[PDB]
């Protein structure tokens, strides 16, 4: 017989929590909205203890703020703003008349928990 | 009656609720007629209960079974439960599965509330009816709500205080670029409620006041005295004694058709000025809001 099951950040279990679990029983993890499970949703009262809880891993928020520096700016949509969810791609065309000053391929990126990696676009 | 009762029920809750609330908190029953209180929640039950045949299989409201759920209705149905728990008998899994569909589904990464589907009685939301600074004006709105909620659901919605603090977060973070006195209003108190109103936010918070006795901005008066009332709530926060008289008289002054906000508001702000402030003012009339 288990305890309450554990908090994970940016998510929570998908039911009501009880007190005490029989063992056998499980419960499921949800993240919050674009965020992303990683690992085993479903956790087991495993003799009196929880198997291991799930990650959330994070989404890239494109602000107006980031637009303004490594001079690149939204290619398809005129959105000010925009949140990608890990393991999914956005896509820059350069500011006011730059060059693609980063790699042979980077204005095409991967969000991946929290971290995305802006092209930079040089003046003139 | 216009149709579509996810709404029209809570239209309708609202003057009741908040007129025991204020009698209650202030204990005026025994002027009013105590005699009167058990009717009043039993008019509660029934809005509530009525409410229940709205609730969708994901916890969330809306104005019809097939209609996509409020963000707005949902957090404004947490919050009147929230007031009425020691009223009558709210089931907790109503009140914290819409708590926490609220965290789950409509809070952005950066902690904005978004309204997907928006309400169709417009006039029920005051002045947020507005389209500048809605991301600020609405996340605020729904913390309050969450405030509201935090002690009856923090244990069974775990994720509650981290969704708050993330909300709080972009308050804060946006608060100094505000202009409108209406989201200064309601993003202060939110602040506020949270401690997290200070420096220059204070600063600015304080000085949108006009003539240090009201928050209020060109449109449809109503909408002031909501702003206001918010205002009265975070001076109260802040224990800022000094500063409410002057807002206390304007809004007790300032006594219908998409009034839902600005009747709420002000009989939760006067009932907590009362309550709170060392010989506070004599004050107005509740039998317009619960009458037999
Ligand atoms: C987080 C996010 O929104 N990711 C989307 C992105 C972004 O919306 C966008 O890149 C930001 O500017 O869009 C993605 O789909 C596009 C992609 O398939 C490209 C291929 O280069 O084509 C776009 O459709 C174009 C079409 O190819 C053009 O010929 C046409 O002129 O316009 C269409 C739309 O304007 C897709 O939108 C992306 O990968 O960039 C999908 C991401 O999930």
Redesign the pocket.
């Given at each position: 017989k288990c305890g309450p099951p554990p908090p994970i950040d940016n998510g929570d279990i998908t039911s009501f929590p009880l007190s005490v679990y029989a063992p056998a029983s499980s419960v499921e993890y949800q993240c919050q909205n674009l965020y992303q499970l990683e690992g085993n949703k479903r956790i087991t009262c495993r003799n009196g203890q929880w198997s291991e809880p799930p990650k959330c891993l994070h989404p890239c928020v494109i602000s107006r703020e980031i637009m303004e520096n490594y001079n690149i700016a939204?290619?398809?949509?005129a959105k000010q703003k925009?949140?990608?969810?890990t393991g999914?791609?956005?896509?820059?065309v350069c500011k006011r008349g730059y060059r693609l000053s980063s790699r042979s391929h980077t204005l095409?990126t991967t969000c991946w928990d929290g971290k995305l990696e802006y092209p930079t676009c040089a003046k003139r | 009656t216009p149709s579509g009762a996810g709404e029209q029920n809570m239209i309708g809750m609202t003057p009741t609720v908040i007129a025991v609330h204020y009698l209650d908190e202030t204990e005026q029953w025994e002027k009013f007629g105590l005699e009167k209180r058990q009717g009043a929640l039993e008019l509660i039950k029934k809005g509530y209960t009525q409410q229940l045949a709205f609730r969708q299989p994901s916890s969330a409201f809306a104005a019809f079974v097939k209609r996509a759920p409020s963000t707005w209705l949902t957090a404004y149905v947490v919050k009147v439960f929230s007031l009425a728990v020691n009223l009558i008998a709210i089931d907790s899994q109503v009140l914290c599965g819409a708590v926490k569909w609220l965290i789950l589904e409509k809070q952005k990464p950066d902690g904005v509330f978004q309204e997907d589907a928006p309400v169709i009685h417009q006039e029920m939301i005051g002045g947020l009816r507005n389209n500048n600074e809605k991301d600020m004006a609405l996340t605020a709105f729904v913390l309050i709500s969450l405030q509201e909620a935090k002690d009856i659901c923090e244990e069974q919605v775990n994720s509650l205080p981290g969704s708050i603090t993330k909300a709080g977060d972009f308050l804060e973070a946006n608060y100094m670029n505000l202009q409108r006195s209406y989201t200064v209003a309601i993003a202060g108190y939110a602040l506020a409620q949270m401690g997290r109103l200070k420096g220059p936010l204070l600063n600015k918070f304080l000085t949108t006041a006009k003539d240090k006795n009201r928050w209020e901005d060109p449109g449809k008066q109503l909408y002031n005295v909501e702003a206001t009332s918010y205002a009265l709530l975070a001076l109260l926060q802040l224990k800022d004694f000094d500063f409410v008289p002057p807002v206390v008289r304007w809004l007790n002054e300032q006594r219908g058709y998409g009034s839902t906000q600005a009747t709420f508001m002000v009989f939760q702000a006067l009932a907590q000025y009362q309550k709170d402030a060392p010989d506070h003012q004599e004050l107005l009339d509740v039998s317009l809001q619960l009458p037999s």
């Open positions: 939204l290619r398809w949509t925009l949140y990608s969810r999914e791609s956005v896509e820059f095409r | -």
